[PDB]
Amino acid sequence: IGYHANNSTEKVDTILERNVTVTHAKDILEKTHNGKLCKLNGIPPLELGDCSIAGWLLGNPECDRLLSVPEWSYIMEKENPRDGLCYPGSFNDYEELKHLLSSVKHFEKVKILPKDRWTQHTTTGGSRACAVSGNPSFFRNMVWLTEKGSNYPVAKGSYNNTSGEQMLIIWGVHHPNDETEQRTLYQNVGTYVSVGTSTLNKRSTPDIATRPKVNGLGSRMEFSWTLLDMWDTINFESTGNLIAPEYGFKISKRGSSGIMKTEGTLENCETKCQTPLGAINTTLPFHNVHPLTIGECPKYVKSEKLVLATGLRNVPGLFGAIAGFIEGGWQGMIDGWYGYHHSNDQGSGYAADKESTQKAFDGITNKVNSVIEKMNTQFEAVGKEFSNLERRLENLNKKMEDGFLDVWTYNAELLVLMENERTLDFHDSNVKNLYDKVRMQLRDNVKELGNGCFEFYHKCDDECMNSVKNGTYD
Amino acid sequence: DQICIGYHANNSTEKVDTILERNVTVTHAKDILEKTHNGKLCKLNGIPPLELGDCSIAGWLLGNPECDRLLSVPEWSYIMEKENPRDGLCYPGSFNDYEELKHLLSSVKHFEKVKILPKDRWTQHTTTGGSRACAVSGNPSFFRNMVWLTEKGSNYPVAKGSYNNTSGEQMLIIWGVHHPNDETEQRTLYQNVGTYVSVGTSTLNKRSTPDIATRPKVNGLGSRMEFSWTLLDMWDTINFESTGNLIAPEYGFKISKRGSSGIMKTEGTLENCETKCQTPLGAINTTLPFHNVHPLTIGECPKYVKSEKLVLATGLRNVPGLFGAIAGFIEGGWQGMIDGWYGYHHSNDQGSGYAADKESTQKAFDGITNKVNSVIEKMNTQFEAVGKEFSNLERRLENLNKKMEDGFLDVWTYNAELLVLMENERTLDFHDSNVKNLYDKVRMQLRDNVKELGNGCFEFYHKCDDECMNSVKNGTYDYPKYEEES
Amino acid sequence: ICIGYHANNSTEKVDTILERNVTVTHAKDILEKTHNGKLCKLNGIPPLELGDCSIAGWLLGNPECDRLLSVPEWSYIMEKENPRDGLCYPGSFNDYEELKHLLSSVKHFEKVKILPKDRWTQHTTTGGSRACAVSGNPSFFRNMVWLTEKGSNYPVAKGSYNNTSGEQMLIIWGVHHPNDETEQRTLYQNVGTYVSVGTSTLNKRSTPDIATRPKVNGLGSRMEFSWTLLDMWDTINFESTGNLIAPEYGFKISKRGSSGIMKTEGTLENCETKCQTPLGAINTTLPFHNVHPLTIGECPKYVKSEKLVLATGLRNVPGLFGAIAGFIEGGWQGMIDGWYGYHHSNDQGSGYAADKESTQKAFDGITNKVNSVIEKMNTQFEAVGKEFSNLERRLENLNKKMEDGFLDVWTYNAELLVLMENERTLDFHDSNVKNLYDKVRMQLRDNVKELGNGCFEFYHKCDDECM
Numbered sequence A: 001i002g003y004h005a006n007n008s009t010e011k012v013d014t015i016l017e018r019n020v021t022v023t024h025a026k027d028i029l030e031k032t033h034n035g036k037l038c039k040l041n042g043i044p045p046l047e048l049g050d051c052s053i054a055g056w057l058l059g060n061p062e063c064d065r066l067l068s069v070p071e072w073s074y075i076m077e078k079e080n081p082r083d084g085l086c087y088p089g090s091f092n093d094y095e096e097l098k099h100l101l102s103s104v105k106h107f108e109k110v111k112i113l114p115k116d117r118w119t120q121h122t123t124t125g126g127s128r129a130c131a132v133s134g135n136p137s138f139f140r141n142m143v144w145l146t147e148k149g150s151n152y153p154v155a156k157g158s159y160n161n162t163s164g165e166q167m168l169i170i171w172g173v174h175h176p177n178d179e180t181e182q183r184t185l186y187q188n189v190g191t192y193v194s195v196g197t198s199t200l201n202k203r204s205t206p207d208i209a210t211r212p213k214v215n216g217l218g219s220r221m222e223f224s225w226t227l228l229d230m231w232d233t234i235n236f237e238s239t240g241n242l243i244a245p246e247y248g249f250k251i252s253k254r255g256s257s258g259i260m261k262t263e264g265t266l267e268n269c270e271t272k273c274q275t276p277l278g279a280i281n282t283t284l285p286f287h288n289v290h291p292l293t294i295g296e297c298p299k300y301v302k303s304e305k306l307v308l309a310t311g312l313r314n315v316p317g318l319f320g321a322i323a324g325f326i327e328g329g330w331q332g333m334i335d336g337w338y339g340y341h342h343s344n345d346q347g348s349g350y351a352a353d354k355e356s357t358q359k360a361f362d363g364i365t366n367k368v369n370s371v372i373e374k375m376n377t378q379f380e381a382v383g384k385e386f387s388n389l390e391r392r393l394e395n396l397n398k399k400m401e402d403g404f405l406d407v408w409t410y411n412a413e414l415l416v417l418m419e420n421e422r423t424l425d426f427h428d429s430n431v432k433n434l435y436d437k438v439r440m441q442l443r444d445n446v447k448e449l450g451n452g453c454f455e456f457y458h459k460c461d462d463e464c465m466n467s468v469k470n471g472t473y474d
Numbered sequence B: 001d002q003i004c005i006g007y008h009a010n011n012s013t014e015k016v017d018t019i020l021e022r023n024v025t026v027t028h029a030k031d032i033l034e035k036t037h038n039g040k041l042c043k044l045n046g047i048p049p050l051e052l053g054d055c056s057i058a059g060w061l062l063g064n065p066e067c068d069r070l071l072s073v074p075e076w077s078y079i080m081e082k083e084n085p086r087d088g089l090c091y092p093g094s095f096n097d098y099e100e101l102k103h104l105l106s107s108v109k110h111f112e113k114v115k116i117l118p119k120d121r122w123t124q125h126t127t128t129g130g131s132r133a134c135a136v137s138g139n140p141s142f143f144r145n146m147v148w149l150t151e152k153g154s155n156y157p158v159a160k161g162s163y164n165n166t167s168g169e170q171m172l173i174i175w176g177v178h179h180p181n182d183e184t185e186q187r188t189l190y191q192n193v194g195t196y197v198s199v200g201t202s203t204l205n206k207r208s209t210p211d212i213a214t215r216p217k218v219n220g221l222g223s224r225m226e227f228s229w230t231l232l233d234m235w236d237t238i239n240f241e242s243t244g245n246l247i248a249p250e251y252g253f254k255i256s257k258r259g260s261s262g263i264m265k266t267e268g269t270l271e272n273c274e275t276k277c278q279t280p281l282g283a284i285n286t287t288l289p290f291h292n293v294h295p296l297t298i299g300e301c302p303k304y305v306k307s308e309k310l311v312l313a314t315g316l317r318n319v320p321g322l323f324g325a326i327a328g329f330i331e332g333g334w335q336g337m338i339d340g341w342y343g344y345h346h347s348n349d350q351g352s353g354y355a356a357d358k359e360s361t362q363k364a365f366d367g368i369t370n371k372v373n374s375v376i377e378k379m380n381t382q383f384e385a386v387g388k389e390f391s392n393l394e395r396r397l398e399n400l401n402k403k404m405e406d407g408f409l410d411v412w413t414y415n416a417e418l419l420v421l422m423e424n425e426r427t428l429d430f431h432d433s434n435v436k437n438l439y440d441k442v443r444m445q446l447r448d449n450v451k452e453l454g455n456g457c458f459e460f461y462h463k464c465d466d467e468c469m470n471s472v473k474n475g476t477y478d479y480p481k482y483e484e485e486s
Numbered sequence C: 001i002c003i004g005y006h007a008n009n010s011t012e013k014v015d016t017i018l019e020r021n022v023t024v025t026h027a028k029d030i031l032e033k034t035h036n037g038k039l040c041k042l043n044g045i046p047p048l049e050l051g052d053c054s055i056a057g058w059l060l061g062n063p064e065c066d067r068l069l070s071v072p073e074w075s076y077i078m079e080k081e082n083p084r085d086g087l088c089y090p091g092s093f094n095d096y097e098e099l100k101h102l103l104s105s106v107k108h109f110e111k112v113k114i115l116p117k118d119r120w121t122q123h124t125t126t127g128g129s130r131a132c133a134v135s136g137n138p139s140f141f142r143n144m145v146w147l148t149e150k151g152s153n154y155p156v157a158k159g160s161y162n163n164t165s166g167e168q169m170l171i172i173w174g175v176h177h178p179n180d181e182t183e184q185r186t187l188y189q190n191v192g193t194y195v196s197v198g199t200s201t202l203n204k205r206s207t208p209d210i211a212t213r214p215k216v217n218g219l220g221s222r223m224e225f226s227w228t229l230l231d232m233w234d235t236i237n238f239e240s241t242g243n244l245i246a247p248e249y250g251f252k253i254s255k256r257g258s259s260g261i262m263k264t265e266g267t268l269e270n271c272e273t274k275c276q277t278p279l280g281a282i283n284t285t286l287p288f289h290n291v292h293p294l295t296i297g298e299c300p301k302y303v304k305s306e307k308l309v310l311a312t313g314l315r316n317v318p319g320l321f322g323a324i325a326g327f328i329e330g331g332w333q334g335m336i337d338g339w340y341g342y343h344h345s346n347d348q349g350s351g352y353a354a355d356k357e358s359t360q361k362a363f364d365g366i367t368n369k370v371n372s373v374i375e376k377m378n379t380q381f382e383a384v385g386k387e388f389s390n391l392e393r394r395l396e397n398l399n400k401k402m403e404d405g406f407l408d409v410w411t412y413n414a415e416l417l418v419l420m421e422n423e424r425t426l427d428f429h430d431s432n433v434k435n436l437y438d439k440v441r442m443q444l445r446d447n448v449k450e451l452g453n454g455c456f457e458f459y460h461k462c463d464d465e466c467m
Helices: A053-058 A094-101 A179-186 A354-373 A391-445 A462-470 B057-062 B098-105 B183-190 B358-377 B395-449 B466-474 C055-060 C096-104 C181-188 C356-375 C393-447
Strands: A025-027 A075-077 A089-091 A106-111 A142-144 A155-160 A167-175 A193-196 A201-204 A220-228 A233-238 A242-245 A247-252 A259-261 A273-275 A294-296 A307-309 A338-340 A446-448 A454-456 B002-007 B029-031 B041-044 B079-081 B093-095 B110-115 B146-148 B159-164 B171-179 B197-200 B205-208 B224-232 B237-242 B246-249 B251-256 B263-265 B270-275 B277-279 B298-300 B311-313 B342-344 B450-452 B457-460 C003-005 C027-029 C039-042 C077-079 C091-093 C108-113 C144-146 C157-162 C169-177 C195-198 C203-206 C222-230 C235-240 C244-247 C249-254 C261-263 C268-273 C275-277 C296-298 C309-311 C340-342 C448-450 C456-458
Touching (some): A053 A094, A142 A167, A201 A220, A233 A242, A338 A354, A338 A391, A338 A462, A354 A391, A391 C096, A391 C393, B002 B395, B171 B197, B205 B224, B224 B237, B342 B358, B342 B395, B342 B466, C003 C393, C039 C275, C055 C096, C055 C169, C077 C096, C091 C096, C144 C169, C222 C235, C340 C356, C393 C448
Parallel strands (some): A075 A259, A089 A220, B079 B263
Antiparallel strands (some): A025 A307, A155 A233, A167 A220, A193 A233, A273 A294, B146 B246, B159 B237, B197 B205, B197 B237, C027 C309, C144 C244, C157 C235, C169 C222, C195 C203, C195 C235, C448 C456
């Protein structure tokens, strides 16, 4: 009676030993990507290229050559894009807006307050900070309302959202550098910008103050945004300083996702799980490619290897058989894990025991499937956006992401160490029972050598052997 | 004459899973997953929930007239609110830090409405302002708890009102600012045009100005009322001052908490049962470590888990393993044995029978009882609310909460599933070992005086009466005899 | 010759999954529960000791905070729960909690004068108040300037500063909210005033909120402070027609790594640690601790356990494999060379001789088990104790629910890991003995009578050479 051995050099670790050589193994740690940024469940990412979401939505001219898909599953944005607010300013609840737009089932720009209908006001206001070909220009999607021939009548504009979808609408307030600038632009001095819906009520006043120049400008534009419900109306009214929308964005979501910081470009592959380094195609329970994934991914883990033993100890244990009283394995056996040798005056040979091998194999298959398929895997974004005044909130997020990282790493490491010493012991027991099963038949008619062999007292031809390996014999 | 070592079997069809096998039939099992509720919404630790019925918390606190018929308890342990109540801000508006206020009120040790700035004392101002958006019987009315200060006969003198909190408890006080639809409305209501509303305490400093703008009509109104709130400490004073547009409180709410809880979205009503753990589907009464009833629980509950079954094997493999005994060289089990898990058969010229081995059965039973108790009682279970409130501009914060709740869900589910799979293969193996040792314990006594058949039976060479058997099952036995030999 | 196992005077108890209060020959506690009682340096760098002050009081320069130490560098902040000296002049501080997090850990911190008090000619500059009194006399936040009318005139106040210090600079300013319109005038002449602050990033125009309030420290007025980080080479511009409480100083700040604040009454003591708690410092390699939840540094997983004892030796007898406390009824106190071994009775003498090879292997295995449980534990720098405002009760609870969530995960897992690993360990020893017995039996065979107690009685004579 003996056990299998081969040319393998695959090493695993158990709870009691390490660097233990086994005959076969399974790695349950995915660590390879494809290097490519891909579609996610068949739907592409929004490719911003060199733009920020602000620049894109406002219509920074340097963002004219963007692709713009009707639908996307996540957003590729560079870390520190180049083209954002060409006209220096700020964007209120910018991060909230990014989350909103992270994943969109349908997205269509539509004209809601046409530039031309602003008669009684100058409409061509631009600036060289938004220059296209030396010439002054402006956010393609916004209108800079300024005095007309020395007069700025109350500006009123409204829009009933009849597009049949929620609509994202953005507006701005211009903050002059000094009182003089305020006048040459708007005539009036104590101005206001007023925005209303069923939900939104807001009246801003310009904050005229002295500031350092950004892109050569001391003035600023502060943008705000809102979701106009279906069949609801938005009302703009202003005595000056209103930067009005010309367009709105029909938006229907969906499921919500996240933004991926990367320099690379979309490549036309598929994936259910994307990382900033490349896409992951795996059934394995854990990965260590990169923490900031998007999609349905394995548990990220701080391990370098998680190798599960599946075969037995390779010898060229709890039950004292394998590498025990049966000193070594048989390379000559290839039909299975456990089996017989048998020496006869009709010839020698190695014959695997198909029934106990098959059972052991079913068990190990079940173990590996348990460790792999009990793992619940849902869609997550991981990489989140936080402002400069949200350092506590950002850290709460980190402490949380790190918290799970440690839980999964420790558990996966130990699950593998514990399950490996069980597996080797399992093989040991399988052999010990095969030996005992044969011993309990032969009894007296054989001398138990002690090396796992039985020397027959009587002659045992090829017909007699088969009975022993069968369970027949007598 | 012969004696046989064996193990219990029964009519059971209960199946469990191990790490190596599945759908394995065992003689007894324990389900450690609670999945039944009582369908009722109950008191929580003896204290009722606040039943809002068709109202929102805003509607309730402000005194929306459609909320007149609410119960109002002095004390509650959580709040039942519908998803999308019907009666909130009858006069269209907003409520600042509304969600924070809901959390504050989620659980309250004592709650009493008290009159702090009596409506009548506002002489020099009109006080009867109402609106048909808050209509009670066609007629115009208003939030029962608030006062709409308006011009009196073409005059709106500065309005001053203060209150020293002498109630001996923190007091929740709410006020509002009215945002007219146009400048004309502003005048016919308040005369003055550049108005303000000013509120102060030792802690709060706020001056609002009305935002007069054009808006779509909600409940037929283009105007809006924006409410704010604060906690007035004990022995501290609140000062209101305004040249117009103040919607002043008439009442305040004595509030003493407590512990903080949460709000439950449901359509159902309180039913007068008890529970330590409430779900939107019904209450849970269990000692089990895990449940799968519903994620949004309130109280002290089992770990919610995405499993369908978590069955722990306690008995042995039902046969009608690591140690090669059970369903091994002892091919099957004995249905005829009912005194225990392991035991003897024995064939005598005085009769046959089955006799369980009380000492090894009792030990095995104590071990399995300890295993099950370990898995169950090591589970730490504290009071939590789970269901949280987030505003429209708090989608990131809400998602952080979800990612967190989902994070633990996966941890517990994976661990519970595997803990059960691992512990089950140990249990079956444990029984196997128990039998193997009982067999070996008998073999090592008899030695020569018996032929080891190989099926777990021993055929005696000498005769072994009922007195001889007892010695073998005792551990006595010996042996001088001998015969045979002969 | 016999086969048996070790026993000793030990009374150390462990629990397994099947039994409890089981006595073993040796054990290892993997739960750290001792501190040194001292508050210490953290990785060689001291904490900022605020003593009786709040961070506001410190930064603004509340006079009652004059005698503070002030280090150029610190790894965390000691602040009392409810300090005594904060805003002596009643008010508020905007995004205060965010500011505390910013300052929790600082690589370099230097106060520098950016808008000298003297250069405010055309304005009165000596404004004080008895709420900030130093020796009866009125005083004011040492780091701030109270700009007031000069002889009945308050010209537009302009002051700017280009950040040339070569480091980000934390700058703080305030707006004074008078009690009534009259106070506004006797302080600033003008009535419709504003305070305006600008940088490349910050744009803000505040107006004073004149209203009636209860007195705090005898004052109905209030000062509302705000703050900003002025980037390197960027400029900040102040402009105001009144009510501006201007900075005289700014704080060069370079961080670092970010940490947290520790609420405590104690004082720094000049010890070292990698892990500090409010009760004392922890020096351990153990995977879990139960000293205190609010730690700072690199600490073991906090856990709700009272004991986590790992069995390492075998069952102490004065199992799965039926040997230990089985057919070999008890252990030998007379054996001291190892865990398993032989007795042997000879006509040349008796004795106990441990089996060095199987003992050494078992010992290597158990050493590996204990090392696995301990060294697989990933331990990173965390702060745990966080600051939340009165209007952040939801956010604070999200943090608690999270901290409690992991506490339960680790506690349950550590408890069960120990229970499961202990029944494996005892069984491991059992198997080791069973195999040593079988290894000897399979040699002797016929030449000996197997007694059944783990001994073999030789048929032939077996001298010391035969043994």
